[PDB]
Structure 1
Amino acid sequence: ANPTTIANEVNTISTIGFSSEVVRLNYLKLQYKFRHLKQTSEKFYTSDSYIGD
Protein backbone atom coordinates (compact mmCIF):
# COMPACT_ATOMS: atom_id res chain seq x y z
CA ALA A 1 0.00 0.00 0.00
CA ASN A 2 0.99 3.65 0.08
CA PRO A 3 3.53 4.50 2.81
CA THR A 4 2.36 5.77 6.18
CA THR A 5 2.83 9.37 7.27
CA ILE A 6 4.53 9.52 10.67
CA ALA A 7 2.75 12.22 12.69
CA ASN A 8 1.55 12.23 16.32
CA GLU A 9 0.64 8.68 17.50
CA VAL A 10 0.05 5.74 15.16
CA ASN A 11 0.81 2.02 15.20
CA THR A 12 -0.93 0.82 12.00
CA ILE A 13 1.78 0.90 9.32
CA SER A 14 1.80 -0.12 5.67
CA THR A 15 3.62 -3.37 4.98
CA ILE A 16 6.10 -4.69 2.43
CA GLY A 17 5.51 -8.27 1.36
CA PHE A 18 7.87 -10.97 0.14
CA SER A 19 7.39 -13.92 -2.19
CA SER A 20 9.42 -16.92 -3.34
CA GLU A 21 9.29 -18.60 -6.74
CA VAL A 22 10.68 -22.03 -7.57
CA VAL A 23 11.76 -22.32 -11.20
CA ARG A 24 11.84 -25.89 -12.50
CA LEU A 25 13.46 -27.24 -15.67
CA ASN A 26 12.30 -30.65 -16.91
CA TYR A 27 14.40 -32.99 -19.06
CA LEU A 28 13.00 -35.84 -21.17
CA LYS A 29 14.76 -38.92 -22.57
CA LEU A 30 13.83 -39.99 -26.10
CA GLN A 31 14.91 -42.81 -28.40
CA TYR A 32 14.80 -43.95 -32.03
CA LYS A 33 15.39 -47.35 -33.62
CA PHE A 34 16.83 -47.99 -37.08
CA ARG A 35 17.46 -51.09 -39.19
CA HIS A 36 20.77 -51.85 -40.87
CA LEU A 37 22.86 -54.66 -42.31
CA LYS A 38 24.62 -57.03 -39.94
CA GLN A 39 28.40 -56.63 -39.79
CA THR A 40 29.24 -60.01 -41.32
CA SER A 41 26.70 -59.58 -44.14
CA GLU A 42 28.32 -56.52 -45.74
CA LYS A 43 30.62 -58.47 -48.07
CA PHE A 44 27.58 -59.95 -49.84
CA TYR A 45 26.29 -56.42 -50.54
CA THR A 46 29.63 -54.71 -51.30
CA SER A 47 29.08 -53.49 -54.83
CA ASP A 48 31.97 -51.82 -56.63
CA SER A 49 30.52 -48.32 -56.22
CA TYR A 50 28.95 -48.66 -52.76
CA ILE A 51 28.02 -50.99 -49.91
CA GLY A 52 24.37 -51.75 -49.28
CA ASP A 53 21.10 -52.91 -50.83
Structure 2
Amino acid sequence: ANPTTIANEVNTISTIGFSSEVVRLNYLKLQYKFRHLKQTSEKFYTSDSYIGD
Protein backbone atom coordinates (compact mmCIF):
# COMPACT_ATOMS: atom_id res chain seq x y z
CA ALA A 1 0.00 0.00 0.00
CA ASN A 2 0.97 3.66 0.06
CA PRO A 3 3.60 4.75 2.62
CA THR A 4 2.59 5.92 6.08
CA THR A 5 3.21 9.51 7.18
CA ILE A 6 5.04 9.64 10.53
CA ALA A 7 3.13 12.41 12.32
CA ASN A 8 2.54 12.54 16.10
CA GLU A 9 1.87 8.96 17.32
CA VAL A 10 1.01 6.06 15.01
CA ASN A 11 1.28 2.28 15.34
CA THR A 12 -0.24 0.89 12.12
CA ILE A 13 2.40 1.13 9.38
CA SER A 14 2.21 0.05 5.75
CA THR A 15 3.85 -3.28 4.94
CA ILE A 16 6.22 -4.54 2.24
CA GLY A 17 5.56 -8.10 1.12
CA PHE A 18 7.87 -10.78 -0.24
CA SER A 19 7.28 -13.69 -2.60
CA SER A 20 9.23 -16.71 -3.86
CA GLU A 21 9.08 -18.33 -7.29
CA VAL A 22 10.41 -21.81 -8.05
CA VAL A 23 11.55 -22.34 -11.65
CA ARG A 24 12.04 -25.90 -12.90
CA LEU A 25 13.74 -27.10 -16.08
CA ASN A 26 12.92 -30.63 -17.27
CA TYR A 27 15.12 -32.92 -19.36
CA LEU A 28 14.21 -35.84 -21.62
CA LYS A 29 16.29 -38.76 -22.91
CA LEU A 30 15.47 -40.09 -26.38
CA GLN A 31 16.90 -42.85 -28.56
CA TYR A 32 17.12 -43.87 -32.21
CA LYS A 33 17.94 -47.25 -33.75
CA PHE A 34 19.65 -47.79 -37.10
CA ARG A 35 20.73 -50.83 -39.12
CA HIS A 36 24.21 -51.36 -40.55
CA LEU A 37 26.51 -53.99 -42.01
CA LYS A 38 28.61 -56.27 -39.82
CA GLN A 39 32.34 -55.60 -39.58
CA THR A 40 33.16 -59.16 -40.67
CA SER A 41 30.66 -58.90 -43.54
CA GLU A 42 32.07 -55.58 -44.80
CA LYS A 43 34.67 -57.49 -46.84
CA PHE A 44 31.87 -59.22 -48.78
CA TYR A 45 30.32 -55.85 -49.74
CA THR A 46 33.48 -53.75 -50.24
CA SER A 47 33.19 -52.79 -53.91
CA ASP A 48 35.66 -50.69 -55.90
CA SER A 49 33.84 -47.36 -55.43
CA TYR A 50 31.05 -47.98 -52.90
CA ILE A 51 31.46 -50.10 -49.77
CA GLY A 52 27.78 -50.84 -49.12
CA ASP A 53 24.88 -52.66 -50.73
TM-score using structure 1 length: 0.89
1:1-53 equivalences in 2 (<5 Å): 1-53=1-53
Deviation digits for residues 3-52 of structure 1 (CA, Å, limit 9, x no counterpart) = 00011121111000011111211111111000001111111111100200
* Unpaired stretches in structure 2, ≥5 consecutive residues: none
Question: Which runs of at least 4 in structure 1 moved beyond 4 Å after TM superposition?
Answer: none
* Unpaired stretches in structure 1, ≥5 consecutive residues: none
TM-score using structure 2 length: 0.89
Kindly tell me the number of residue pairs found equivalent between the two proteins.
Answer: 53
More strand by share: 1
Please provide the CA RMSD for this pair: 0.9
